[PDB]
Design a protein around this nucleic acid. Structure first.
Lengths: 89, 83, 81
RNA sequence: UGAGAGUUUGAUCCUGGCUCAGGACGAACGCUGGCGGCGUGCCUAAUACAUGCAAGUCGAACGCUUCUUUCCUUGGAAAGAGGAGUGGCGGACGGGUGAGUAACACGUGGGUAACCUACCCAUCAGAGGGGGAUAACACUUGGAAACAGGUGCUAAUACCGCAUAACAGUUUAUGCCGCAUGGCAUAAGAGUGAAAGGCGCUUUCGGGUGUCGCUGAUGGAUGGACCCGCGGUGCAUUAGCUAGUUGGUGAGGUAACGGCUCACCAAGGCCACGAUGCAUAGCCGACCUGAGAGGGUGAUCGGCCACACUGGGACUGAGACACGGCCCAGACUCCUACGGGAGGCAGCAGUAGGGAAUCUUCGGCAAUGGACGAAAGUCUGACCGAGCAACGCCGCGUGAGUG
RNA sequence: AACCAGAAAGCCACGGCUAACUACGUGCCAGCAGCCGCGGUAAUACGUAGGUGGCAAGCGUUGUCCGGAUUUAUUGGGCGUAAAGCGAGCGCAGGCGGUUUCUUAAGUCUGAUGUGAAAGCCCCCGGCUCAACCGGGGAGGGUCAUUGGAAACUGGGAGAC
């Protein structure tokens, strides 16, 4: 039950997150599999820097993004391209 | 064969047990602090079918799977035997 | 302390009752079969075949998980002749 | 990228010890004590623990008890109301602690033609239909209680058979890697399977459909399990150790190979390249130091292993031989009308005790992260923050030009 | 944003090593000290005085680990007299070996490929008004693992002097 989600790396009051794919059994800041992009909480608009050969080729493997991660990665229309293009078959 | 095993050479010490030989591979290391070429030895136990090799033969063997109470390699080929 | 795990005690006890009952039924079926094959008297095949088929009916309803039921039918097929 | 001073003598050169100048601390102890930005805080007794909070949630498989509403004013459709369950999923994650362990426990490098895996994308037939028996509730029995019995009702995705899958596995047939055993594709020989099922739309016929399931069995993803080469400790004032031990044959058993376990046969196996024995110790990323080779340590943060008062044993469950779950034995402690009962601070605060010495019996899911749930919500001493301490680093201060 | 340098500085030593002083009452007693050593009218080692002398909310003391220590010396030590060649021989195991032809390639070096988690110590660049926090790169984590080559030297086999 892999699940791409956040990882809090702040100092004391100023956080900094990295979008990362980890199994749900693992803790909030424990291990993972790989770091797929990042996001400052601060400074809207903060960048979604990606290779994006990972998200497209990773939800297709079968994964479920959480609340914040999906609702910011919908700004590139990622899986809609994909299950649009499952008609390629 | 989509993945290789590890094959080892060596010679035979003693094979008084049925279907079973004893293979010694042998090389030289360094001392970790000092530097000369110390030599040492191991004694494997490899499985044989039908009493192929004898005492003193250079033979070679392959990693197989857990086959018994720790005798775990399979004989390949009697290479060089003397009397 | 106990909070809600006492539900699971009753659940697991009832599961013990029915699981042990059905598996003892399976074991006595296999025992009846193996005593039938070693007999070798009259009706050496027809009650044998009815016993084989009742054993397999009991086996696939049963649980090991799935694997050693097939081992049971392999070691059971070789016990024909 | 490598700095040397003091002290043996009446004075000298050698050799040789002792001591100092440099850093570092989970430190302590005396003196001093302005503010803020980041951290850290039982190293001793894994000693005994009062008190309060650490894990629940569920209508769309399901059914039955308890509120207010216009409820044909006697019961009333209908909305939110529901105690335990045929009843699912969670409680094997998340947090603690280093007592054990000198071995495949760890670190690297590899294997599995000897392996298992609760959601998603699907994958060959699908996606059979039919049937039948029971708790809560009501009455009663013993006791103040923890609680333990009878008589009567009901619900289904529990129960039942029944033909519908051999692609399980075997034989045979047909093409290659080998690593011998064997396995990888196509068709046949003999045996076998189940959840017969929900909320909504249209409802012309009296059933088409959107969100939901179960397989005869496959694939990916994830997690777990087995097995090998090499490496990291002191003692010879510790030199022999081994009898399921070492091999074969057959059977059982396991997620699978295997003395893992049995029955039989032969006496094998390990050792100076340090076995066996005694003692100490969790391992690693790393940290301090040094020119470097090295030496020392494994507390903050991350990964693995092992433990739940002490010692055994299984069950449910995909997953535990289960932190909190069950059963049994042992030590301790508590309540009572004395007949009987109850429990494990190595969760967060806190208590005695030890010690030279280490904090508050606070707020809240606003945020990130779980668990349940069509979805709002619900749980959270995870976590986010406020306390306390000069314990460490600091950004600084108590103006600049002046008389 | 209206007004102030007011509200707002600390601590141990001075005989040599040890940069960092002079003088006064104390009198082998009371005392000091890391080592050397000081005390009987001098303590330039108790108190006083101004000084002097040190980092930037600190400063001394105790305890523990590395350096200096070439004082376990592989890098990097020695044995006539200073510690140190057994009283002397015979020899199992072990260590090390004359010249040369061919040959294997264990040791040897090298090309390519895979990995050496994240965070650290580094370096470059940004923000945090400078400590701390994050970001991308690289030696950094092997005596590693597989695949291809050399036979100069030592192992190994066949011979030769």
């Amino acid at each position: 039950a892999v699940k791409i989600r956040l990882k809090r790396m702040g100092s004391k009051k100023s956080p900094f997150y990295r979008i990362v794919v980890a199994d749900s059994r693992s803790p909030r800041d424990g291990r993972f599999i790989e770091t797929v992009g990042t996001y400052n909480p601060l400074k809207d608009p903060a960048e979604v820097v990606l290779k994006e050969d990972l998200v497209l080729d990773w939800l297709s493997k079968g994964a479920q993004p959480s609340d914040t991660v999906r609702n910011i990665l919908s700004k590139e229309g990622v899986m809609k391209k994909h299950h649009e293009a499952k008609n390629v078959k | 064969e989509r993945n290789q095993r590890k094959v080892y050479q060596g010679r035979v010490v003693s094979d008084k047990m049925d279907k079973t030989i004893t293979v010694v591979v042998e090389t030289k290391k360094n001392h970790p602090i000092y530097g000369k070429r110390m030599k040492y030895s191991k004694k494997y136990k490899a499985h044989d079918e039908n009493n192929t090799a004898k005492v003193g033969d250079i033979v070679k063997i392959m990693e197989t799977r857990p086959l018994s109470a720790t005798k775990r390699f399979r004989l390949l080929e009697v290479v060089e035997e003397a009397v | 302390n106990i909070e809600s795990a006492i539900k699971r005690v009753r659940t697991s006890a009832n599961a013990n009752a029915k699981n042990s009952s059905q598996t003892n039924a399976m074991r006595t079926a296999i025992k009846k079969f193996e005593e039938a094959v070693a007999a070798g008297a009259d009706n050496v095949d027809a009650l044998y075949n009815e016993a084989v088929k009742a054993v397999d009916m009991a086996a696939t309803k049963g649980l090991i998980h799935k694997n050693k039921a097939n081992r049971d039918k392999i070691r059971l097929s070789k016990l024909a002749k």
